[PDB]
Amino acid sequence: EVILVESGGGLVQPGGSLRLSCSTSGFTFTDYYMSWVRQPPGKALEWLGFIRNKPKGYTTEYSASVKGRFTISRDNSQSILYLQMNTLRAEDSATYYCVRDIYSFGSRDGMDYWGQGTSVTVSSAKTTPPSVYPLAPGSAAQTNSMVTLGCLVKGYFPEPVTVTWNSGSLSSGVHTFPAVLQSDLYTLSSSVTVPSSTWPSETVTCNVAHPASSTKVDKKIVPRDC
């Protein structure tokens, strides 16, 4: 299958530099134009530029917003695409996508494959690991078909963090709220709803991962006793 995987994202100082990578497999890399597209948290997609295919000499083009500041290149031996960013600023904070563009002008068009994206934050605020607290039912744990539990993920920087339940096995009935920033620190909570017959009979644990600080923590939800 066609595979596109971005890497290299992280936290960088304003005025700093960063080079993102995109590893590909599953198709003849040299036959394709490759594009980079970014997207701030909850904003629109913005095309940044591309590098053409082999018959086109691997030449490059850029959006007026980053031309002269960003540089696209590629390693045809390893089938890897790169994006070198310079003199970074707050407006450059976003999720960056690697995308397979056209291989032929006459047969078709469109960016038919997209990676999952890699996150970038430009800030001078320091990296801080989150504290994870359990949100357990107290007087609840009664009789009413379903029960809702949660995990509070507080005081971290920068975004993002990923929250799963029971290592991913528990996926339905789960939603995580958007983080809120305050004084250089983010906070969010995750909610999970399961039938009373499954908890606390069977365990429920939230798994929290914060790559920027290389942290991965677990928090088992135990019912409150009083």
Partner 1 sequence: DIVMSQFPSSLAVSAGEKVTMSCKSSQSLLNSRTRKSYLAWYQQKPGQFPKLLIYWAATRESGVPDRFTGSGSGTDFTLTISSVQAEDLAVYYCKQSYNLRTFGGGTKLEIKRADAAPTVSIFPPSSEQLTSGGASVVCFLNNFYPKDINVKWKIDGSERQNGVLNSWTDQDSKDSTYSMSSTLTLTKDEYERHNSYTCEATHKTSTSPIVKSFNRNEC
Q: Which residues bind partner 1 (CB under 8 A)?
A: 35, 37, 44-47, 49-50, 61, 63-64, 97, 102, 108-112, 114-117, 131, 133-140, 148, 150, 152, 154, 175-180, 182, 187-189, 191, 193, 224, 226
Residue type, 53: N
Could you tell me how many residues of this chain bind Mg ion (CB under 5 A)?
Answer: 2
Contact indicator for 225, 136 with CB cutoff of 8 Å: no
* Two tokens, residue 109: 């068009």
The CA distance from 158 to 154, in Å, is 12
Binds 152: which of partner 1, Mg ion, none (CB < 5-8 Å by kind): partner 1
Subset of 33-62 contacting Mg ion (CB under 5 A): 46-47
Question: Which one, 38 or 100, has the nearer CB to Mg ion?
Answer: 38
The CA distance from 63 to 52, in Å, is 15
Question: Which one, 46 or 61, has the nearer CB to Mg ion?
Answer: 46
- Chain centroid to Cα 172, Å, comes to 20
User: Coil, strand, or helix at residue 45?
Assistant: coil
Which residue in 167, 189, 179 sits closest to 41, CA to CA? Answer: 179
Residues pairing with 174 in the sheet: 192
CB of 192 to Mg ion, least distance (A): 35
Binds 191: which of Mg ion, partner 1, none (CB < 5-8 Å by kind): partner 1
Question: Which one, 134 or 211, has the nearer CB to partner 1?
Answer: 134
Binds 179: which of Mg ion, partner 1, none (CB < 5-8 Å by kind): partner 1
CB of 47 to Mg ion, least distance (A): 4
Binds 44: which of Mg ion, partner 1, none (CB < 5-8 Å by kind): partner 1
Rg (CA), the chain: 22
In the chain the first and final C-alpha atoms are separated, in Å, by: 54
**Contacting residues toward Mg ion, per CB under 5 A:** 46-47
